[PDB]
Design a binder for this molecule. Structure first.
Ligand code: MG
Ligand code: MG
Ligand code: MG
Ligand code: MG
Ligand code: MG
Ligand code: MG
Ligand code: MG
Ligand code: MG
Ligand code: MG
Ligand code: MG
Ligand code: MG
Ligand code: MG
Lengths: 109, 48
RNA sequence: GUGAACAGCCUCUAGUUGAUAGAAUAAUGUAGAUAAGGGAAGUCGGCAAAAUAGAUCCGUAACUUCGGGAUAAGGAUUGGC
RNA sequence: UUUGCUCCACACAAUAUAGAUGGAUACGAAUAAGGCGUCCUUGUGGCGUCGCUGAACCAUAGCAGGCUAGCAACGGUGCACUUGGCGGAAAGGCCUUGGGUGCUUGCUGGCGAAUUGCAAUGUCAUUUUGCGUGGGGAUAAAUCAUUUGUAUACGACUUAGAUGUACAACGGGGUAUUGUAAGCAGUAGAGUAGCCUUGGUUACGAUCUGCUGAGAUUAAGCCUUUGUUGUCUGAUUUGU
């Protein structure tokens, strides 16, 4: 619960972005991925890799992929103030297709 | 139950159903049963 | 680049990414659209909107100051290889 | 719950009073008719009686009602108990049983009262609440936050959530939409350009054909789930 752990998930950005304004789809995808990481790792401090932001914006503001495969690593941080000592870091996995993949524990990184 | 005794020949009619639609309401449902769907469509690539 | 084109649309060099934001997606709006069948019955009034539209070929009336009217009207064709 | 809550009794405090100062004392119906009593032959009966207002009835004497002694009679009345019943229109009252106890002014005595100074409401009722002393009893919820979308401008509404026929994210299946994916192959292809063992071969070629009703998408307010992974005690407030 309050430990370090890395898991790989698939997020259904299609259903999360259904009906969203085109100029807001990619920013909405960023916020939905933050909500996803907060739901699965319980951290308010979610940090998105710039490579993940590139993957989100890869096809413009409206062309967000239907499914994104993310590696979410809940890691502990210790800094100026406590402020949610656990934070989650989200990176892309860079698989060929983000289809037919279940949540797995990484166990190595 | 009704609050009065309706006798209007629209009540008092004995209805016998001849058929009940069970095609999908999630679209323009074409088949009543998966068996009828398989019989119409023949063998598909996934199975059937 | 397309194209007749300094049109529209996309791109290079250069420049900017500046307009208070976040969350929802009721009514009524502003702006943009669609609509069965009918087709101006609406309305002071076809207002608004729709329809037409480029190019090539054919065809083109009354009237006329003989210069026009005229893209009259009305049709056909258009991609790729 | 920094010893909370509630019920009974008691004391002490406040708090006021739409206004106690003997008793709201129960048929129903009619009124050109009735009530009561009585009788029989039980009726729309006979007889008697009454009203002419409650000006009644009951209660009512005692230091705001003290302390005592008797007589008479087994009555009245307060009280706490106790027996059984009836009453739902708002019953929360009505009746009833037995014993105990107090008083009795039904009658006859004994003692007390004063000086509140010639009157001054001259304080006697009931309404809530609080606190303390004992005794009995009980041992939750709601809201925020998260979540749902049968809801929705915001509030509000409807849902779910402490270890499960739980919930969620994925994945699987069903359903549905479109219309046959990429890739590879072809003695398909209008033809065109080369080569020579001149019937083939190489190159270009919209397109066609096969794998392929394939591929893609499918809840975001679709249905379903023996799979995978995870989550499940944060905040505020509420007492008769
Ligand atoms: Mg929409
Ligand atoms: Mg339907
Ligand atoms: Mg040109
Ligand atoms: Mg129409
Ligand atoms: Mg029409
Ligand atoms: Mg017409
Ligand atoms: Mg008219
Ligand atoms: Mg008119
Ligand atoms: Mg007119
Ligand atoms: Mg106009
Ligand atoms: Mg013309
Ligand atoms: Mg003319």
């Amino acid at each position: 619960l309050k430990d370090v752990v890395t898991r790989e998930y698939t997020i259904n950005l299609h259903k999360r972005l259904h009906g969203v304004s085109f100029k807001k789809r990619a920013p909405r995808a960023v916020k939905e991925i933050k909500k996803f990481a907060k739901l699965h790792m319980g951290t308010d401090d979610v940090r998105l890799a710039p490579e993940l932001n590139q993957a989100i914006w890869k096809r413009g503001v409206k062309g967000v992929e239907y499914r994104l495969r993310l590696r979410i690593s809940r890691k502990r941080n210790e800094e100026e103030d406590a402020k949610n000592p656990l934070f989650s870091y989200v990176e892309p996995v860079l698989v060929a297709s983000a289809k037919g993949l279940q949540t797995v524990v990484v166990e190595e990184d | 139950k009704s609050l009065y005794t309706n006798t209007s020949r629209k009540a008092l009619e004995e209805v016998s159903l001849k058929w009940i639609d069970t095609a999908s309401k999630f679209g323009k449902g074409r088949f009543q049963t998966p068996a009828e769907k398989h019989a119409f469509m023949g063998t598909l690539k996934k199975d059937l």
